[PDB]
Homo-oligomer: A and B are copies of this chain.
Amino acid sequence: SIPETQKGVIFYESHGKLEYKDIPVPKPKANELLINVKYSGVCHTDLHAWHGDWPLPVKLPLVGGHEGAGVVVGMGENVKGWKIGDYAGIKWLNGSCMACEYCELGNESNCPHADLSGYTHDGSFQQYATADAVQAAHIPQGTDLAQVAPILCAGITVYKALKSANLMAGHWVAISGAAGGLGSLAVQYAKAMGYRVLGIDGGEGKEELFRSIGGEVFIDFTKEKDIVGAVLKATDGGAHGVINVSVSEAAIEASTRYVRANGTTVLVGMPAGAKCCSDVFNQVVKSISIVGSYVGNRADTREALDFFARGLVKSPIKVVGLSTLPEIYEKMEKGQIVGRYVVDTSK
């Protein structure tokens, strides 16, 4: 019934060959779900873990991926709150000691023993994966496993970020990078949560797309020469919260100048070796807050997933084969980052 062999996209070296091939089916432990993965999300994070850019050592031979949507096929004796057949979601955060200051506060991310899918643990580019029964998303029955896989990283994240911005219904939120993978989700979660949405992005088509998902006010950065000035103009003081999901330092630092007084600019985008250098006078005189926001926790997960379940949030995906993958890892270099890729494991 459960096979011993399966297909996966492994690699035997830091920045080396990307062999799609037959590998073992991993056994699960007493705390783990055996998940038959149907679709795996794909984003730039999986390109970095491959290279060895981040300095934490990598678990070679390693199956990347951290956005797996699938089905509970087996489980360790001690697993709880899980039936066979349940739909299960594998996130960046695979596991945690569950016995430290941080793990107790739902800040399992900052756990010194953070187990990470597609990095220290074998991720979601394979037909069968193990996961911690606790951290695994509980996907409700009747949800397109393809469509949801993007929610499992970018969606949780942008939702958590949005709570962290610390807003009320009726407040303005600026999404800096609002036609991007993260931006366009941010825009929908923002709208569903009661907020007024202004947006910043550039060039061909990105404005019509923004409107078509409920954005109110667009600031074309290519045409508009004084971004701050318009943002202030448009919000009659400056945006109450701000989400930074561009890949541009300039645009982050701009954020400290268009955010409102008593307001909160939030860091999600982590451009390579970037630094946010805010003027101290401005920041004190206006009691401005600058908050970083990492992945989410079990609660954030459940919530983020309910808006999707309510149909209030959707990702414009496009599905390709799991054997295809090296091309995608290749295209991510070449520049053809463009829309949300998801991988079928049957192919």
Contacts and interface: CB of A to CB of B under 8 A. Distances in A.
| Most chain B CB neighbours (cut-off 10 Å) among A81, A106, A290 | A290
Contacts of A281: 54-55, 270, 273-274
Nearest to A133: B99
A299 B169 contact: no
Task: State the number of copies, please.
Answer: 4
Contacts of A298: 104
A30 interface: yes
B283 A290 contact: yes
Interface string A104-116: 1111011001000
A97 B80 contact: yes
A138 interface: yes
Nearest to A309: B170
A133 to B, nearest CB: 7
A280 B286 contact: no
Q: Per DSSP, are chain A's interface residues mostly helix, strand or loop, or mixed?
A: loop
A270 B292 contact: no
A206 interface: no
B280 A277 contact: no
A327 interface: no
Interface stretch (A17-25, A217-225, A261-269): A261-269
Given A101-B299, A289-B289, A267 B279 contact: no
A98 B77 contact: no
A170 B133 CA distance: 25
Contacts of A55: 281
A141 interface: no
Interface residues of A, number: 73
Interface string A3-47: 000000000000000000000000001110000000000000000
A231 to B, nearest CB: 17
A134 B280 CA distance: 29
A209 interface: no
Contacts of A81: 97-100
A284 interface: yes
Contact of A267 (B97, B110, B169, B283): B283
A55 B279 CA distance: 11
A163 B171 CA distance: 14
Contacts of A78: 29-31, 78
A307 interface: yes
Nearest to A81: B99
A329 interface: no
Contacts of A293: 284, 287
B290 A289 contact: yes
26 contacts: A55-B281, A80-B97, A80-B98, A80-B99, A80-B113, A98-B98, A104-B106, A104-B297, A104-B298, A104-B302, A105-B106, A110-B262, A110-B286, A252-B280, A267-B280, A267-B283, A270-B281, A274-B279, A274-B280, A275-B279, A276-B277, A276-B283, A283-B292, A289-B289, A290-B290, A290-B291
